[PDB]
C-alpha cells in the first residue's frame, strides 16, 4: 500500500498539544506497529493460500477449508486496526480549520474505546497461537478432513508480539485517562 | 503364518527406512494358513504309512 | 496504482471554502475509503481467478463461469467510485484558474447524485454477501456445474463495510443539501 | 510505469495561456484518462495470456491464437494514445525557452488530428465489445479450433468507457476549433 | 528500475546552452523514448521465456533455443541505448564544476557517433520483424526442432516504432552537425 | 517495505549531540546494515518455500519440515533487529519536544543491551552456516525424511557477514560505554 | 531495492573537494555502474533458478546443482561491490561534522584497494563467460548429471561489460594515485 499518504497525514496531525503519556503512546504506535506491519508483516502472509493444502481429492475443499480456518487475514486486521486507532488523532486536521480542551477529552475516551475493542476482538478472533494442523468439516469436503498450514510458527510469534504491543498501548491509554481524572 | 499389510524397508536406493503397503494381505494370509494345514495333513498321512510299513 | 497523483490533486483542491458538513464528509472519504482501498483492498482480490475452480473437465468453463459470477471486480468498482465522487471537488481547480456560490450549489447537487447512484448500483450489482458456491449454466460448460469461490468471507466483510461507509457519505450529503435548503 | 515524470512534465507545461474549452479538455484528460489507466486498467489485462486457453493438444497453438486474437493489448494502446495526445501540450516547454499565437493554432489543429486519428483507430482495431469465444485457423493449429478469453465483460465495459471519453474529447476539440474559426 | 534518478540528472544537465535543433532532439528523446520504454515496453517482454515453447521432449532444449533465438532482449538493448545516448549530455555536470564551445562540438560529434552506431547495431541484431516460428538446431535438441514465440506482433510494432524514432534522432543529429559546419 | 519513512525519522533523529564512537557506529549501521538488507537481502529469501523440497509422497510434510527447519526467516530477524537497535536513537524525537546528558547515558546502556541480546539470539537461532540437507521427523511425515534447501551457500555468506557486522557494532558500543566510564 | 537512499547519501557526500580524475571516476561509477545495475541487471537474474533444469529424476538435485554452479548471483555481487566502493566517499559525511587532506589520501588508498580487490575477486569467482551446460557431481545426484542454464549469453555480455567498467575504474584510481605521488 501507499503508507506515505498516511505518514504525511500523521505528520500534519501531530501538531496538537499533547501530554507526556500521549507522546509515549504515539512513539509506541509509530515504531512498534506501523514500521513493522509496513515492512515485515506483508511478506509472511503472502503465500498463505498457495501453500495451504488438504488431504483430499475433492475440488473446492481447499477454498472452503481455508476460508473456514482463516476468515480474515492477520495482516489486514492489523492494518485496519492501525488506521482506526489513528482516527481520533486525524480528526484534529478537520477541527483545526474550524477554530481559525473538550476535543482532547473526546479524543482520549474514543482512543481508549478503540484500543480496548480491537484488543478484545483480536483475542476472540485468533487467540494466542496458530496451529499447524486444521480439522475441516464443511462442504464440499467429505465428512472430516485434515489440512496443513504454511508458516505456523512465524505467525504465532507475530500474534504474540502484536498482542504485547496492543497491551502496552492500552495500559498507556488507561494511564492518561486516569491522569485526566 | 501371516502376511502383514505394512512393510518397513531400508534397502538402497531408499533413504533411511521407508514404509510400503501390500496388496491383498488378508487373502494371502488365508491362503498361507490353508496350505499349511493341507501340507500338515499330508505329512501326517505319510508318517502314518511310514510307521505302518516301517519297522 | 499511483495514488500520490490523486492525493496531490486533492490537496490542491481542498483550498475551497466549505461548511462543517462538507469537511466531515471529506474526512470520511479520505479516511474510510481512500486509505482502505489503496492499502487493504488490492491484495484480497489478487488471486480471485487463480483460485476459482469448477467441478468439470471442460476447457474454458472456468473462464466462462468466473466472468458470469464476477462481471466486474469489487475493488475496481470501488476505485472508479472513489475517482468519480471526487470529480466535483476536482473541478474547483479549473473554476479557480478560470476566475483568476453557484458553483458550490452545483457541486453539492452533483455530489449527492453521484453518491446515491453509486450506492444503488452497488446494491444491484453485488448485494450484501458473497457466497462460497456458484451454479453455472453457460457455454462451453455442460448443463449445470458447480464452482467454488476464493475468500468468500473476507469479501463479504468488505462489502458490508463499504456499504456502511457509502451510506454515511449519503446521509452527510443529504444533511448538507438540506442545510443549503 | 513511472507516471510521476509525465505528471511533472504536464504540471510544467500547463503554464500556457488557454481558453475555457482547453481547460475543460485538460480536466477531462487528466481525470477520465490518466487516473483510470494508471490505477485501474493495468490489473485487468495482467493475466490475459496466462488465462487464455484453446481446445487442442497442439503445442504452440495458444501463442498463435492469442496473437491473432489480440495483436495489441488495449492498455498499451491507451497508454500510447495518452502519451501522444499530450505531445502538442508538451511542446510548449521547448517553445517557451526560445523567447527567454500561431503556436496555439498549430497545437489545436494537431491535437484535433491526433484525437480523431486515435478514435478511428480504436474503432477499427477493436470495435465495441470483446467476445468470450474465438475461432482460430492459424498455424500450427489444425484446421479450425475454439479458444476462450479471460474477463470478456470487464474489458467490454472498459472499451465502451474509453470510447465515450475519447468522443467527449473529440467534441471539445471540435468546439474549440470552431471557436478559433 | 529507478528512472527518477536518471530524470533528476537529466534535469540538472539540461541547463547547458543549446541550439534549436538540440532542443528538438531532446524533446524527441524525452517523449518518444524514455516515457515509452519506462511505461509500455517492460510489460511486453515480461513472459517471453515463460511462454516460449518448443515441440520436443528433450530437457534443456527450451533454454537453448530461447537463448539462440533472443540473445539479448529488445527492452534491455533499448534501455542501454537510452542510457548511453544521454552520456554526452551528462558530462556537462562534470564539466561545469571544473569551469566554476569545444565541449559542445565534442558532445555533438560523440552523440552522432552513438546514435548511428546504435541504429546500425539494432538493424543487424534484430531486423524489421519478429516471426512467430523459429527453427532450432542446437544442443541438446535433436537435429532440427520448431519453437513458438510469445506476442510476435506486439514486438514487431515495437521494433518498427523504435527504428523510426532512432532514425528521426539520427537525422536531427546530422542536421545539427551540418549546422556547426 | 517503505524504508523511506524510517530514513526520514533517522534523519530527524541524528540531530542529537554525539561523540566520535557514536558517529562511527551510526555510519556502520547506515552503511553495512540498512543499505544491504533493503536492497540485497530481500531477493535471496524470496523463493525459500517454493524451492524447498522433501523426498516423500505425504501431503503437508513440506510445510511441516520447512517450519521446523526455518522457524523465522533470516531477513525478518535482521529487519526486526535493525528497527529495534535504532529505537534508543528514535526516542530523541520524543525527548526533544519536552525540553522545549542522563538521556544520553540511558541511550548508550540500552543500545549495548539490545546489540548484545540480538547478537546472542542470532548465534542461538541459526549458528554459523546453512546446510543443504535437513532431516525431519515431524507429523504428518513418516518416521524420518530428508529435505533439500534452496540457495544454502548464499545464505551462509549472508549469515557470516551479518555476524561480523553485528560484532563490530557490539565492540563499538563497548568502546563508547568504557569511554563514558 | 531503495536506491534513492543511496543516491541522497551520494548527493550529500559529493560536496568534498576533488581533482579532475576523481570526478571522472565518480562520473563513470554513477553512469556505467549504478544506473545499469538498478534498471537493467535485476530482471536478467530473476528466473535463474525457476528456469534451471537438470536431466534427472532425483528430488533435490536441481537445488544442489544450482547452488554448486552459481554460489553467489552476479547481480548481488555487483550491488555489494557498488555499495562498498562508495564507502570511502561516504565517510566524508562523518568527517565533516567532526571538522565543524590526510583524509583525502586515505580515501584514495582505500578506494584503490577496494577496486583492485573486487576486480580480482570477480575474475576468480566467475571468469569471462557463462556456459550453457553444467556438469554436476554432488549429492543427492547420482554420479554425473548434466544441467542447463537460463539466458547464458545475456549474462556473458553483462560479465564482459562489468569487467570492462571495473578495469576503467581501476585505471583511473591508479592514475590519481600516481598523481598524488
Curated annotation (Swiss-Prot), chains A, C, D, E, F, G:
<keyword id="KW-1003">Cell membrane</keyword>
<keyword id="KW-0303">Gap junction</keyword>
<dbReference type="InterPro" id="IPR000500">
    <property type="entry name" value="Connexin"/>
</dbReference>
<keyword id="KW-0472">Membrane</keyword>
<feature type="topological domain" description="Cytoplasmic">
    <location>
        <begin position="1"/>
        <end position="18"/>
    </location>
</feature>
<dbReference type="GO" id="GO:0005243">
    <property type="term" value="F:gap junction channel activity"/>
</dbReference>
<keyword id="KW-0812">Transmembrane</keyword>
<comment type="similarity">
    <text>Belongs to the connexin family. Delta-type subfamily.</text>
</comment>
<feature type="transmembrane region" description="Helical">
    <location>
        <begin position="158"/>
        <end position="180"/>
    </location>
</feature>
<dbReference type="InterPro" id="IPR017990">
    <property type="entry name" value="Connexin_CS"/>
</dbReference>
<dbReference type="GO" id="GO:0005886">
    <property type="term" value="C:plasma membrane"/>
</dbReference>
<dbReference type="Pfam" id="PF00029">
    <property type="entry name" value="Connexin"/>
</dbReference>
<feature type="transmembrane region" description="Helical">
    <location>
        <begin position="103"/>
        <end position="125"/>
    </location>
</feature>
<dbReference type="GO" id="GO:0007601">
    <property type="term" value="P:visual perception"/>
</dbReference>
<feature type="topological domain" description="Extracellular">
    <location>
        <begin position="42"/>
        <end position="74"/>
    </location>
</feature>
<feature type="transmembrane region" description="Helical">
    <location>
        <begin position="19"/>
        <end position="41"/>
    </location>
</feature>
<keyword id="KW-0965">Cell junction</keyword>
<feature type="transmembrane region" description="Helical">
    <location>
        <begin position="75"/>
        <end position="97"/>
    </location>
</feature>
<comment type="subunit">
    <text>A connexon is composed of a hexamer of connexins.</text>
</comment>
<keyword id="KW-1133">Transmembrane helix</keyword>
<dbReference type="GO" id="GO:0007268">
    <property type="term" value="P:chemical synaptic transmission"/>
</dbReference>
<dbReference type="InterPro" id="IPR002260">
    <property type="entry name" value="Connexin36"/>
</dbReference>
From Swiss-Prot, chain B:
<feature type="transmembrane region" description="Helical">
    <location>
        <begin position="31"/>
        <end position="53"/>
    </location>
</feature>
<feature type="topological domain" description="Extracellular">
    <location>
        <begin position="1"/>
        <end position="30"/>
    </location>
</feature>
<comment type="subunit">
    <text>A connexon is composed of a hexamer of connexins.</text>
</comment>
<comment type="function">
    <text>One gap junction consists of a cluster of closely packed pairs of transmembrane channels, the connexons, through which materials of low MW diffuse from one cell to a neighboring cell.</text>
</comment>
<protein>
    <recommendedName>
        <fullName>Gap junction delta-2 protein</fullName>
    </recommendedName>
</protein>
<comment type="similarity">
    <text>Belongs to the connexin family. Delta-type subfamily.</text>
</comment>
